[PDB]
Amino acid sequence: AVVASLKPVGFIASAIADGVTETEVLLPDGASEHDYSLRPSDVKRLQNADLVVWVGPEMEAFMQKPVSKLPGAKQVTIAQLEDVKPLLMKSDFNMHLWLSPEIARATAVAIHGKLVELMPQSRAKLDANLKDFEAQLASTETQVGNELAPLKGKGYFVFHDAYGYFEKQFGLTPLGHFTVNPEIQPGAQRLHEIRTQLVEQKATCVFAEPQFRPAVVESVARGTSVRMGTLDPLGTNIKLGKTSYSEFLSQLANQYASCLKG
């Protein structure tokens, strides 16, 4: 199998590996990229992988050691790809790379190249999968761009700073985030200051995330006219599959729009 660290990385892998080999995801549904320790069975899946795909040591540090044990031919370290380095955006760089369509393309290309070498019998299928992935992703970018266009200029806060690549591509205008690392409590001072900004800068939304209890986000919204939504940067409800990555970007767009639209 192809073993991906995070579900949306699994979505990209599953576009390319469809009808070639299975895709497995290490980080379980409901867990955060910022808070994991590999279970004994996760370590086994990784050791037995045909190919491992992950962002890199500045993101999923919990897996740097076992990944380093694998042959180079059996890993894709997205953040270290020559195609990806020029696309990295400064936060020290933002490592939430799976929300960048262009980085997703570079990732798909790298997965394709690795699997063509490992599984030469599947060359035609891999080629067709990559072609299909790119066609679908282009369609999705057009659709998501259109959906988000009327929402540009509307202010909002996100729970943690995960969305920068996606927001930059589609022209969304967040005012800020409650947290950088969602494992760190923002503190009461920060919270009343966020409310002040939401009110003074006439923000539309605040967003919770399914991986974290929303009480803190709800507490800031209270007293104000700000609407509450939810963004899921890990696409928890979406199943792996050929069109899963496009489904994920479309779902994220819908989550923004559900709250931000008037």
Q: How far is the CB of 9 from Zn ion (least distance, A)?
A: 13
Q: Are 30 and 211 in contact (CB under 8 A)?
A: yes
192 is in an annotated binding site: no
Q: Which residue is nearest to Zn ion (CB)?
A: 162
Shortest distance, CB of residue 183 to Zn ion, whole angstroms? 10
Closest CB to Zn ion among residues 84, 162: 162
**Minimum distance between the CB of residue 117 and Zn ion, rounded to whole angstroms?**
31
Q: Which of 58/117 has CB closer to Zn ion? A: 58
In the complex, the residues that contact Zn ion under the rule CB under 5 A are: 33, 162
Nearer to Zn ion, 81 or 162 (CB): 162
For the bound state, the minimum distance from the C-beta of residue 160 to Zn ion, rounded and expressed in Å, comes to 5
Q: How many Cα atoms sit within 13 Å of 245 on the Cβ side? A: 34
**Cα–Cα distance for residue pair 201/181, rounded to 1 Å:** 24
112 is in an annotated binding site: no
CA atoms of 244 and 117, how far apart (whole Å): 24
Q: Which is nearer to Zn ion, 47 or 181 (CB)?
A: 181
How many CA within 13 A on the CB side of residue 178? 28
Note whether 149 and 171 are within 8 A (CB). yes
For the CA atoms of 4, 10, 12, 14, what is the dihedral angle to 10 degrees?
110
Binding residues for Zn(2+): 33-34, 96, 160
Binding residues: 33-34, 96, 160
